[PDB]
């Protein structure tokens, strides 16, 4: 009812190899062909990848910037407000970005800002202008 384990006998396969006098050596040459061509492609892409890895030599280390550690403050300076408006103009609704720019405000403080000052900063307008981009 079941073939020996490690013995692979499929119906499809037996009819495919019995059909002819040398359908056997045909299938087994096509597979050798498939094999050599796949191995060749591996060579190609191993090479391609070797080149790309060569380009990335140097990491991004010369370009990394140290991290500002400013503690979150609750008071909005005039400055911080202005930063914030421009931040909205450039980033729209990406609050996290905005918080990172201002550097001493949290995301929720940023949302609060959105609402409190909506009247006075014409935040609506600002936002639609960001959306045009």
């Amino acid at each position: 009812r079941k073939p020996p384990k490690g013995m692979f006998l499929s119906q499809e396969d037996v009819e495919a190899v019995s059909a002819n006098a040398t359908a056997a050596t045909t299938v087994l040459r096509q597979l050798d062909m498939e094999l050599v061509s796949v191995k060749r492609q591996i060579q190609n892409i191993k090479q391609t990848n070797s080149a790309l890895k060569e380009k990335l030599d140097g990491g991004i280390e010369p370009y990394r910037l140290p991290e500002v550690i400013q503690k979150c403050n609750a008071r909005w300076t005039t400055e911080e407000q202005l930063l914030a408006v421009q931040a909205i103009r450039k980033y729209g609704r990406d609050f996290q970005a905005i918080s990172d720019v201002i550097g001493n405000k949290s995301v929720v403080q940023v949302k609060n800002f959105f609402v409190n000052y909506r009247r006075r900063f014409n935040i609506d307008e600002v936002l639609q202008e960001w959306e045009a981009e």
Binding site: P3, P4, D13, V101
Partner: protein
């Protein structure tokens, strides 16, 4: 088993059922109450037991009833019927027993038996035992037929039958109690030496042996679970099946390699896209960084758009940098995944050359046990005798197997050097025409009530005919004869003056260089006490080596032997002998095999006796005149001495029922 059930098992009978044969003789009993069936059955098994427990003397009915116990010894006619059936069909009082009741004063009927092979001798002895005039005609100058034992001095070596294939249910058991046979176990351990002379490493011996066995199982599965028996209007052979199974294994291996290397390209290409992504990102980071530097360039005090510019560029750079770093993590993971796949590649091949060659030696072992190229065996039926194989270790005969035919021939009217030329069988009797083999001008004519033909299937197969039948055998018999397979196998006896091999090793192999020569001198035996090695030739190689001179052949032998044992340790054989069984005109081959296109049903056809048409027309149907025995005629035990023996017992029983009448059936 043990007890009376032991006896029944040993008599190749089911201890708890009546057989078809028994049904035939005792239809009253088997269509009756299960009780009397059990009585019957005990009477049977017990009588069997008694015979078996001491087969050196005739078991008379009186003795039997004497040792029967009640209630079983009440119905004495049941006992008599039973005993008689047993004696008749050679379940008891067969072989070489001391006769209590000395033979019948006058004989009834006349039987001429062609061939004093083992089957011949058997039937003859039984028929005589029954009080019939029996004469055997034998073409050779010796008894035994395909039991052929070489002797010179103390050197003794069979070129014919060599092995008792187990004593569990073997009649040869009874014989060996009756004859002095030095039986010797065979140590089934067999080292293999590669054509060079180096032993095959245990690792290899085992990986290969195991793969062999799996391939066989495979074919069986193709056969029986898949009905792959017929391929293109032509029946499949074991050999073809094997080759297909193998081709699929190689196919599967290439498939595995293709799937693996494709996983490697899939991943490698992932890495490619990631790498691209990372390079473009790095370039953006270079550019952006430049821009941020240019913005910190502007010294304070600066207005708020300027300040926003620095802050925003900074936020963006920290962003892109973060992203690049994640990508680089991913790159690490992919690279190590690729090192894993490049690390666990599936198996390079299915079989190396050393591989396929050792495998070829296992195939040659198969070709040898069947005496034929695996390309000729029936896929569906080659193994069909396997269900009846005996139990216990296979054994050799140290004094030679000849002793048995010889033993049997005692008391028998045997005409040697008498080659039967033609058989004539008619409504009224038979005449056999034979010649002297020495002077084939001299002629003999033998007249008889029936002929027992135990001509080898090879002989019967001959074209043009070595023996002529008048009238001709009916198409159904001749077709059966054509359909069967009569195969071929040969031996080389090597007699040296001192043992130069491992004396604890009964047997050892040699692996052939080619697939084609896989059967040439593939195996060797030391079974004799004396220094004698036996080199075996089977498969396609069997037939071909027969056209090569003795000398060349012992040459290829000592060659192999020197390769394995060193040129300075192997000496010229004092005596050498080489079988050529297909060439022998009395054998015309070694033994039958289920040819592809044949079935075990053909063996049954072979055993069907022939009934001549009436002499006068509109005259009643006549009694059968021609009967067949021998190894080719026994379905469950073909190509064996015990099979020959059994077929002999059979036909003698049938013949005797015919001409003497069966008193035990009322």
């Amino acid at each position: 088993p043990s007890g009376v059930e032991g006896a029944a098992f040993q008599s190749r009978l089911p201890h708890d059922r009546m057989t078809s044969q028994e049904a035939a003789c005792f239809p009253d009993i088997i269509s009756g109450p299960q009780q009397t069936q059990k009585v019957f059955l005990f009477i049977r098994n017990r009588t069997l037991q008694l015979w078996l427990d001491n087969p050196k003397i005739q078991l008379t009915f009186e003795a039997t009833l004497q040792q029967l116990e009640a209630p079983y010894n009440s119905d004495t006619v049941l006992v008599h019927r039973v005993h008689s059936y047993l004696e008749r069909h050679g379940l008891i009082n067969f072989g070489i027993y001391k006769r209590i009741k000395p033979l019948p004063t006058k004989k009834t009927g006349k039987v001429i038996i062609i061939g004093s092979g083992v089957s011949g001798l058997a039937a003859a002895r039984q028929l005589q035992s029954f009080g019939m005039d029996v004469t055997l005609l034998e073409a050779r100058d010796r008894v035994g037929g395909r039991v052929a034992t070489f002797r010179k001095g103390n050197y003794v070596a069979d070129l014919g039958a060599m092995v008792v294939t187990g004593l569990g249910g073997n009649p040869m058991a009874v014989v060996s109690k009756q004859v002095n046979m030095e039986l010797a176990k065979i140590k089934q351990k067999c080292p293999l030496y590669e054509a060079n002379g180096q032993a095959v490493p245990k690792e290899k011996d085992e990986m290969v042996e195991q793969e062999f066995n799996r391939l066989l199982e495979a074919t069986s599965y193709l056969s029986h679970q898949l009905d792959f028996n017929v391929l293109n209007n032509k029946p499949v052979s074991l050999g073809q099946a094997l080759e297909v199974v193998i081709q699929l294994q190689e196919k599967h291996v290439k498939d595995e390699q293709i799937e693996h290397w494709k996983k490697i390209v899939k991943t490698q290409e992932e890495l490619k896209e990631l790498l691209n992504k990372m390079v473009n990102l790095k370039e953006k980071i270079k550019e952006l960084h430049q821009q941020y530097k240019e913005a910190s360039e502007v010294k304070p005090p600066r207005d708020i758009t300027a300040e926003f510019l620095v802050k925003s560029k900074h936020r963006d750079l920290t962003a892109l940098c973060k992203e690049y770093d994640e990508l680089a993590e991913t790159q690490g993971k992919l690279e190590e995944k690729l090192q894993e796949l490049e690390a666990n590649p599936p198996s390079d091949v299915y079989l190396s050359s050393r591989d396929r060659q050792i495998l070829d030696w296992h195939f040659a072992n198969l070709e040898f046990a069947n005496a034929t190229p695996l390309s000729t065996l029936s896929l569906k039926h080659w193994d069909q005798d396997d269900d009846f194989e005996f139990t216990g270790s296979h054994l050799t005969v140290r004094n030679g197997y000849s002793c048995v035919p010889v033993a049997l021939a005692e008391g028998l009217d045997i005409k040697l050097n008498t080659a039967v030329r033609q058989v004539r069988y008619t409504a009224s009797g038979c005449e056999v025409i034979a010649v002297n083999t020495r002077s084939t001008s001299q002629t003999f004519i033998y007249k008889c009530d029936a002929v027992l033909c135990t001509l080898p299937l090879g002989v019967l197969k001959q074209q043009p005919p070595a023996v002529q039948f008048v009238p001709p055998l009916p198409e159904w018999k001749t077709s059966a004869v054509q359909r069967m397979g009569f195969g071929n196998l040969n031996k080389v006896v090597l007699c040296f003056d001192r043992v130069f091999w491992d004396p604890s090793v009964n047997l050892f192999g040699h692996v052939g260089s080619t697939t084609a020569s896989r059967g040439e001198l593939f195996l060797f035996w030391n079974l004799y006490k004396a220094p004698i090695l036996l080199a075996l030739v089977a498969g396609e190689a069997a037939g071909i080596m027969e056209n090569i001179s003795d000398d060349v052949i012992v040459g290829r032998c000592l060659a192999i032997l020197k390769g394995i044992f060193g040129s300075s340790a192997v000496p010229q054989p004092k005596e050498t002998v080489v079988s050529r069984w297909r060439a022998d005109p009395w054998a015309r081959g070694s033994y039958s095999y289920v040819a592809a296109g044949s079935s075990g049903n053909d063996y049954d056809l072979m055993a069907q006796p022939i009934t001549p048409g009436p002499s006068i027309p509109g005259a009643p149907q006549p009694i059968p005149r021609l009967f067949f025995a021998g190894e080719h005629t026994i379905r469950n035990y073909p190509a064996t001495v015990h099979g020959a023996l059994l077929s002999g017992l059979r036909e003698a029983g049938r013949i005797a029922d015919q001409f003497l009448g069966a008193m035990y059936t009322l």
